[PDB]
Every structure is written in structure tokens, then in C-alpha cells.
Amino acid sequence: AKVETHEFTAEISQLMSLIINTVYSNKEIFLRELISNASDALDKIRYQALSDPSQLESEPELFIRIIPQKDQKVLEIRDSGIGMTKADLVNNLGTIAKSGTKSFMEALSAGADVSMIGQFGVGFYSLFLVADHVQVISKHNDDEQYVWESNAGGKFTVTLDETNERLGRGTMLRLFLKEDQLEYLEEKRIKEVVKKHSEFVAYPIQLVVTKEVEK
Ligand SMILES: Nc1nc2sc(CNC3CCN(C[C@@](O)(Cn4cncn4)c4ccc(F)cc4F)CC3)cc2n(-c2ccc3c(c2)N(c2ccccc2)CCO3)c1=O
Numbered sequence: 001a002k003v004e005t006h007e008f009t010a011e012i013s014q015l016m017s018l019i020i021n022t023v024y025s026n027k028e029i030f031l032r033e034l035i036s037n038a039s040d041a042l043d044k045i046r047y048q049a050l051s052d053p054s055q056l057e058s059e060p061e062l063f064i065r066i067i068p069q070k071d072q073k074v075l076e077i078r079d080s081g082i083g084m085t086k087a088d089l090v091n092n093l094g095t096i097a098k099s100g101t102k103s104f105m106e107a108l109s110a111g112a113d114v115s116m117i118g119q120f121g122v123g124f125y126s127l128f129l130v131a132d133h134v135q136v137i138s139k140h141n142d143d144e145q146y147v148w149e150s151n152a153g154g155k156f157t158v159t160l161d162e163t164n165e166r167l168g169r170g171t172m173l174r175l176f177l178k179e180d181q182l183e184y185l186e187e188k189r190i191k192e193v194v195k196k197h198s199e200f201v202a203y204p205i206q207l208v209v210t211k212e213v214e215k
């Protein structure tokens with residue numbers, strides 16, 4: 001029930017600061033990166049389930065789901081992948097992301113396009129192109145549901161989740177969109193971006209659209 005506060009490694013903190021402030025033109029690539037991450041998580045539970053099919057019982061369906069929350073200025077990206085335990089969420093520290101982070105910053109200084117972020121293994125942080133904070137809600141078969149929260153500063157929190165929908169298994173990124181990036185709440189725009197950048201994905205990409213029933 002306590003909010004545990006933790007500190008990012010310096011390299012991650014520095015990368016988030018670069019990304020949240022960059023004026024890069026092609027911000028829509030964040031969605032490709034997050035879909036790719038969702039797919040990779042799905043691959044991992046599929047791999048487990050091939051050995052042990054009972055691993056799917058927590059959430060039998062394998063999906064990626066995009067849920068615009070217009071009234072909240074939030075975009076949710078949900079998967080039924082393997083998920084993250086509390087210890088996984090706390091351990092972006094002491095992880096391959098440290099290496100990816102530093103190398104990627106050096107590449108940026110050399111002129112690399114921001115769209116190369118996923119080649120360094122740190123495409124998760126591309127969400128700060130369009131969002132000023134994020135909650136990562138996650139449920140792994142081995143642990144309870146937790147929420148990790150970051151505003152691109154030096155600290156993050158991890159809290160036992162007593163306030164969100166039950167995921168069953170997997171991860172949901174809740175992106176609090178920047179005021180100039182609200183185009184990513186619109187059905188038409190999300191479809192365009194998915195079609196352009198995420199043609200080859202093994203799992204259904206479900207878009208949740210809210211429409212008024214009219215006469
Ligand atoms: N939608 C998603 N679902 C998932 S679900 C998952 C499981 N991730 C586990 C990582 C640890 N893994 C252990 C490992 O398997 C790795 N390993 C295998 N061989 C060599 N090493 C292993 C096993 C045994 C052992 F002894 C040592 C080990 F390290 C198991 C999978 C990660 C993940 N991510 C994601 C992808 C991108 C990321 C982050 C998170 N980051 C992030 C982390 C926390 C909070 C916010 C963001 C930051 C960087 O980028 C998703 O967005």
C-alpha cells in the first residue's frame with residue numbers, strides 16, 4: 001500500500017530529459033516502439049506457454065489493445081504479455097537499458113535519427129516524445145499487480161495496484177499526453193500510424209473506440 005520511491009540511474013534520467021524536450025518532427029514513431037515492446041512481451045508468454053499451457057490461464061487471449069481516454073487526455077497501450085513483477089519494475093536499474101541508453105545518446109550526438117531508438121533497445125523511452133508522464137501497470141503470473149510511475153525526472157514510484165482494472169496478465173502503459181499531442185487520441189490518426197509502422201505484428205492490434213449512439 002506504501003508508495004516506494006526509487007532513483008533512476010543517471011544515464012536513464014539523462015535520456016528521458018533529452019527525449020521529453022526534443023523537437024524531433026516524427027513523434028508518431030513512439031507507437032511503433034510501444035507496439036514492438038508489447039509484441040516482444042507476448043512472445044515471451046507464448047514461449048512459456050508452449051512448455052506449460054497453464055501459464056495462459058491468467059488471461060487466455062493474446063492481444064495488443066490501444067484505448068484512447070479522451071476526457072483524461074490519456075492514451076493506454078495494453079498487452080497480455082508476460083508482464084513484470086514488482087522486482088522487474090524496480091529493476092530498470094541494473095538492466096541492459098543502462099547500456100542501450102548511453103550508446104544511444106552518443107549516437108544522437110553523432111547525428112542519429114531519434115527513430116533509431118529501438119535499435120539500442122530503449123524504444124520504451126520514446127513515449128516521452130508525446131507524453132509528459134506515464135504509469136506502467138503490470139501483472140506477472142508470479143506477483144500481484146503493480147503500478148510504476150515516472151515524469152521523466154530522476155525519481156519513479158512503485159505502488160501495489162489497488163486502483164486500476166485487473167489486467168489478468170500483462171502490461172498497460174498509460175500515457176498522459178502533452179497538450180499539443182492530442183491527435184493520438186483520434187481513431188483515424190491511430191489507424192494511420194499503426195498501418196504505416198506496425199504492418200508486421202503477430203498479435204491482433206485492437207483499437208477501442210467510444211462513439212455516441214445517435215438517432
Ligand atoms: N509492454 C511491456 N511488457 C514488458 S514484459 C517485460 C519483461 N522483461 C523482463 C526483464 C528481465 N528478464 C530477465 C532475463 O530473462 C533477461 N535475460 C535473459 N537472458 C539474458 N538476460 C533473465 C533471466 C534469468 C536470469 F538469471 C537473468 C536475467 F536477466 C525477464 C523479462 C518488459 C516489458 N516491457 C518493457 C520493454 C522494454 C523496456 C522496459 C519494459 N522498461 C521498463 C521497466 C520497468 C518499468 C518501466 C519500463 C525499460 C526499458 O525497456 C514492456 O514495455
Ligand SMILES: [Mg+2]
Nearest residue numbers: 055141142143
Ligand atoms: Mg511462475
